Write an enzyme that holds these catalytic residues in place. Sequence first.
Site, PDB file in Angstrom:
ATOM      1  N   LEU A  23       2.619  -1.433   0.641  1.00 18.89           N
ATOM      2  CA  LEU A  23       2.437  -1.917   2.046  1.00 18.89           C
ATOM      3  C   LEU A  23       1.561  -0.612   2.793  1.00 18.89           C
ATOM      4  O   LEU A  23       0.788  -1.321   3.843  1.00 18.89           O
ATOM      5  CB  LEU A  23       3.938  -1.787   2.581  1.00 18.89           C
ATOM      6  CG  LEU A  23       5.076  -2.367   1.985  1.00 18.89           C
ATOM      7  CD1 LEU A  23       6.314  -2.065   2.268  1.00 18.89           C
ATOM      8  CD2 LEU A  23       4.746  -3.799   1.889  1.00 18.89           C
ATOM      9  N   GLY A  24       1.464   0.386   2.319  1.00 18.93           N
ATOM     10  CA  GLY A  24       0.686   1.367   3.139  1.00 18.93           C
ATOM     11  C   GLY A  24      -0.021   2.546   2.442  1.00 18.93           C
ATOM     12  O   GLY A  24       1.191   2.985   1.443  1.00 18.93           O
ATOM     13  N   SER A  25      -1.026   3.177   2.286  1.00 16.87           N
ATOM     14  CA  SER A  25      -1.580   4.259   1.429  1.00 16.87           C
ATOM     15  C   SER A  25      -2.025   5.236   2.425  1.00 16.87           C
ATOM     16  O   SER A  25      -2.622   5.029   3.511  1.00 16.87           O
ATOM     17  CB  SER A  25      -2.567   3.632   0.644  1.00 16.87           C
ATOM     18  OG  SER A  25      -2.585   4.424  -0.673  1.00 16.87           O
ATOM     19  N   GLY A  26      -1.618   6.419   1.998  1.00 17.03           N
ATOM     20  CA  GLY A  26      -2.130   7.705   2.701  1.00 17.03           C
ATOM     21  C   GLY A  26      -2.205   8.815   1.703  1.00 17.03           C
ATOM     22  O   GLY A  26      -1.635   8.740   0.653  1.00 17.03           O
ATOM     23  N   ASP A 138      10.651  10.723  19.733  1.00 22.54           N
ATOM     24  CA  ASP A 138       9.389   9.849  19.467  1.00 22.54           C
ATOM     25  C   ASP A 138       9.559   8.369  19.506  1.00 22.54           C
ATOM     26  O   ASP A 138       9.228   7.637  18.473  1.00 22.54           O
ATOM     27  CB  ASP A 138       8.715  10.520  18.260  1.00 22.54           C
ATOM     28  CG  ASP A 138       7.209  10.029  18.026  1.00 22.54           C
ATOM     29  OD1 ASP A 138       6.861   8.987  18.968  1.00 22.54           O
ATOM     30  OD2 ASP A 138       6.678  10.243  16.933  1.00 22.54           O
TER      31      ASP A 138
HETATM   32  C1  LIG Z   1       2.968   0.476   6.884  1.00 26.96           C
HETATM   33  N1  LIG Z   1       4.462  -0.349   6.802  1.00 26.96           N
HETATM   34  C2  LIG Z   1       4.546  -1.390   6.593  1.00 26.96           C
HETATM   35  C3  LIG Z   1       3.945  -2.730   6.901  1.00 26.96           C
HETATM   36  C4  LIG Z   1       4.639  -3.674   6.565  1.00 26.96           C
HETATM   37  C5  LIG Z   1       5.643  -3.948   6.459  1.00 26.96           C
HETATM   38  C6  LIG Z   1       6.551  -2.875   6.284  1.00 26.96           C
HETATM   39  C7  LIG Z   1       6.040  -1.520   6.516  1.00 26.96           C
HETATM   40  C8  LIG Z   1       6.376  -0.371   6.214  1.00 26.96           C
HETATM   41  C9  LIG Z   1       7.657   0.183   6.010  1.00 26.96           C
HETATM   42  C10 LIG Z   1       7.981   1.620   6.122  1.00 26.96           C
HETATM   43  C11 LIG Z   1       6.860   2.349   6.537  1.00 26.96           C
HETATM   44  C12 LIG Z   1       6.798   3.730   6.246  1.00 26.96           C
HETATM   45  C13 LIG Z   1       7.611   4.679   6.110  1.00 26.96           C
HETATM   46  C14 LIG Z   1       7.216   5.873   6.287  1.00 26.96           C
HETATM   47  C15 LIG Z   1       6.172   6.275   6.357  1.00 26.96           C
HETATM   48  C16 LIG Z   1       5.094   5.497   6.612  1.00 26.96           C
HETATM   49  C17 LIG Z   1       5.550   3.929   6.560  1.00 26.96           C
HETATM   50  N2  LIG Z   1       4.687   2.925   6.621  1.00 26.96           N
HETATM   51  C18 LIG Z   1       3.401   2.772   6.916  1.00 26.96           C
HETATM   52  C19 LIG Z   1       2.962   3.744   8.198  1.00 26.96           C
HETATM   53  C20 LIG Z   1       2.201   2.937   9.179  1.00 26.96           C
HETATM   54  N3  LIG Z   1       1.689   2.341   9.801  1.00 26.96           N
HETATM   55  C21 LIG Z   1       5.631   1.795   6.592  1.00 26.96           C
HETATM   56  C22 LIG Z   1       5.407   0.427   6.376  1.00 26.96           C
HETATM   57  C23 LIG Z   1       9.243   1.923   5.949  1.00 26.96           C
HETATM   58  N4  LIG Z   1       9.722   0.400   5.765  1.00 26.96           N
HETATM   59  C24 LIG Z   1       8.766  -0.272   5.797  1.00 26.96           C
HETATM   60  O1  LIG Z   1       9.055  -1.673   5.746  1.00 26.96           O
END
Ligand SMILES: Cn1c2ccccc2c2c3c(c4c5ccccc5n(CCC#N)c4c21)CNC3=O
Length: 288
Positions: A23-26, A138
Amino acid sequence: GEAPNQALLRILKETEFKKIKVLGSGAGTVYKGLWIPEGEKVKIPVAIKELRSPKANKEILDEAYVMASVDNPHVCRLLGICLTSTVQLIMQLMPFGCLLDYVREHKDNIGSQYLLNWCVQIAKGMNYLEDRRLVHRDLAARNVLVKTPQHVKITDFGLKVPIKWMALESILHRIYTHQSDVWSYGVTVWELMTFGSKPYDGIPASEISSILEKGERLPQPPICTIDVYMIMVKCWMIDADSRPKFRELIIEFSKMARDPQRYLVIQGDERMLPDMDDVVDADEYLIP
Ligand SMILES: Cn1c2ccccc2c2c3c(c4c5ccccc5n(CCC#N)c4c21)CNC3=O
């Protein structure tokens, strides 16, 4: 004299869960995934955070400590952790992303009943953290996740600085209180009513502290009646005891949510949202 934290921490094996997609990369990476508890005939949609040795493990394990400690229908829950070479955090999956993105992508199709209901749920979640004596520090639309359009949950309570969201006393004196969280709640609400706009846009963060001291605040959104804006403004008072309690904010928005068209005026408001056999949501799966 605080009471013992009897929260259970669950350790999961990497065999128990599988990563379908990211769902996300860093430079941590978050995967959509599925979790099959051992011997349960259940599949649970999860989000898994993994880190590429960093010794920032003190920061991730602290975050996991806070998520296991909380249980609420409007606070994000941690399912377990995995003590792999690179530690993995397993949380419930919020398919629709953060509320900020959700509001920006769907502004043209989001109605006033949704907006008001979100403000209620956020205030319910923040009121829970008050009961647990937890200060979020936050709150912002980026830190509210969307399980369904009907259901959102607070996240990131464990932890550049977000000056635009911070109370004034936090900016001057690094003071964080539940009442400073109410301020940040006001900015969040403002973000949703403006359909994801950026607060104090084009203004340098250094300037913001004096701006507030002058008495300037964020402007009233177009959809917003004076009743709703009035509530946001109360959050942004200098005197933290003057600002509303989260418990009062639930009440006020719940009243408005019964007659949403009277408190928010949105064009076309009436007309305007969205082997899997063993799949259960994490909220239906609880263990005792
Ligand atoms: C980017 N992202 C999503 C994009 C579409 C659907 C869900 C997410 C998601 C989720 C989480 C995270 C999450 C948890 C900890 C750190 C970063 C996380 N991200 C992406 C950060 C951003 N923007 C999450 C995230 C933690 N649970 C998530 O669904």
